[PDB]
Amino acid sequence: KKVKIAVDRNPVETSFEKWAKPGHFSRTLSKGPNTTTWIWNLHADAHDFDSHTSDLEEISRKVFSAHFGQLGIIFIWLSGMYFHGARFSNYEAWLSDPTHIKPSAQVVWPIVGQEILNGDVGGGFQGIQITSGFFQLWRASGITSELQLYTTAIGGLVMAAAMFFAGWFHYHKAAPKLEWFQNVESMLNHHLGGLLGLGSLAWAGHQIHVSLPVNKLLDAGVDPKEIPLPHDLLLNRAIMADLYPSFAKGIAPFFTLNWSEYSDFLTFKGGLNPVTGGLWLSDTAHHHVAIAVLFLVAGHMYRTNWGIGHSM
């Protein structure tokens, strides 16, 4: 077949000997510095992988593993934000009174008089009023606790370790061949159907089962400690049916094409929630379901290994 997994086994030795030789990637920098222009060129040419070599296979392998590094770093950054919201935050206080409490997730150490930046943001808390929108995003996801943010941070660190391992693996241990990267049809099929289709479908599911009930109870004045945890909504269909009666019917209306039964949590209200000033999360869930279907059909467009599909 033409679309297949193709890799070189152990192409590059994992060794520190090239860390100790700055400018190894270049033939014009491996000769060592004589001028400082060398010190600048070592950094300008570090990621110009097409000027290190000229064959597309090693370039593509370097690119793939560097993308894995970037993803690991983004995961470190996300885990850091979630952790600072779990440890150095006024988030649990902000849920109870979001209209008066300033979101803050960064506390400053009192060292050189800079504890003045730890301002009176609210919630019996002193810190830097953040502008990232992470509190609103977490309330939309239905967090309602610092423990969930802490465990999201731990998961993000695990995923960062996974990404860095994957970069090391896909460069040093089993690096894909060039013909694997040039499967743009399969790459697009998977990135539309899987990355965006299954991703939007999974987020729609989270919103059906976690975000919508948690935020419907939050908008009903229920204190976040009285709100059922997401797994109690997953397990007990009676609670969800009490919030959204269509859950009493199960997933039968989906398979019987009686989709209008789901108009309780799959809406087209448009506008804004008058309690929060944000979008209706039922509209958002329906949106993500719709674009999930759309991307999943879009990811069946290109021809990979069977006769159906398109050759771009």
């Binding site: 520190f16 860390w19 100790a20 700055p22 010190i39 060292i111 050189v112 008089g113």
Partner: protein
């Protein structure tokens, strides 16, 4: 690990370590001896 310690002896790593050290020393001096406008002790 001769090559790893050669890497740690590189200009950027040594600079990072040395300036972390200097900044931490100054920060601890300013924590234990706060607000030193003049040499009076």
């Amino acid at each position: 690990m001769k090559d790893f310690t050669t890497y740690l002896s590189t200009a950027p790593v040594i600079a990072t370590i040395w300036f972390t050290f200097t900044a931490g020393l100054l920060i601890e001096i300013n924590r234990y001896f706060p607000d030193p406008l003049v040499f009076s002790f």
